[PDB]
């Protein structure tokens, strides 16, 4: 059973999570537009848009705004790519504005390595197989965003105090909405680490793209520190 002081948290987070959707104008390009250059450019347009979503979400995460201004940036930079993996996963696993088939085909043909694309979809399947709830997507995202063990975090203790309550709620739901299998809570947290493997790759990939004269936006150059 969930407490009323926990109950306020979940509603707040689910409310924050639902309070931002991706513009049709951007997602319409998955349908309408033509090339490997185009497919890449579209993905870039959604990456940029999702950084803003993430920021607006993160601001509404309870207790975030009190954190050290220099820690707040570190938490966003270190978590961006991961949150984007989850959002895509949610879309492909659940969507009307997703266009699963088209979008997948565009991703596949963007001049991006299979070394990276192959595991990406292996991940999407597996996280879809978990038959994950919109609460479980929304809470895991916050948890990821507020991961204390990011690089360049000054005051790691202060993050843990914000993260742990969100884990404690999640463990409650894994027993409530998933009583048969108790390992369900630990299946969710296995992702947190698999999602971390994709960070490591992403920096290597990012270089690959840069040297191929790939152009990115001022917000993505900032979030990933492109010179």
């Amino acid at each position: 059973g969930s407490t009323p002081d926990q109950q306020t948290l979940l509603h707040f987070i689910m409310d924050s999570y639902n309070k931002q959707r991706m513009p049709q104008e951007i997602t319409n390009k998955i349908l309408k537009e033509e090339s490997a250059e185009e497919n890449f450019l579209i993905l870039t347009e959604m990456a940029t848009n999702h950084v803003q979503v993430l920021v607006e979400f993160t601001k509404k995460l309870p207790g975030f705004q009190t954190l050290d201004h220099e820690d707040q940036i570190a938490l966003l930079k270190g978590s961006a790519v991961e949150a984007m993996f989850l959002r895509s996963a949610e879309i492909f696993n659940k969507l009307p504005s997703g266009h699963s088939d088209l979008l997948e085909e565009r991703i596949r043909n963007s001049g991006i390595s299979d070394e990276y694309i192959t595991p990406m979809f292996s991940f999407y399947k597996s996280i879809g197989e978990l038959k994950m709830t919109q609460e479980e997507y929304a809470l895991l995202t916050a948890i990821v965003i507020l991961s204390p063990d990011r690089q360049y975090i000054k005051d790691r203790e202060a993050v843990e105090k914000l993260q742990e309550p969100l884990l404690d709620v999640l463990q409650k739901l894994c027993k409530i909405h998933q009583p048969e299998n108790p390992q369900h809570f630990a299946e969710l947290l296995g992702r947190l680490t698999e999602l971390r493997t994709f960070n490591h790759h992403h920096a290597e990939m990012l270089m690959s793209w840069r040297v191929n004269d790939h152009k990115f936006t001022p917000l993505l150059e900032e979030i990933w520190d492109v010179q």
């Binding site: 803003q52 920021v55 607006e56 601001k59 201004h69 707040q72 940036i73 966003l76 001022p218 917000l219 900032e222 979030i223």
Partner: peptide, 11 residues
């Protein structure tokens, strides 16, 4: 450094 994320965090 990081003018934009700040701007977005303070809007």
């Amino acid at each position: 450094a990081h003018q934009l994320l700040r701007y977005l965090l303070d809007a």
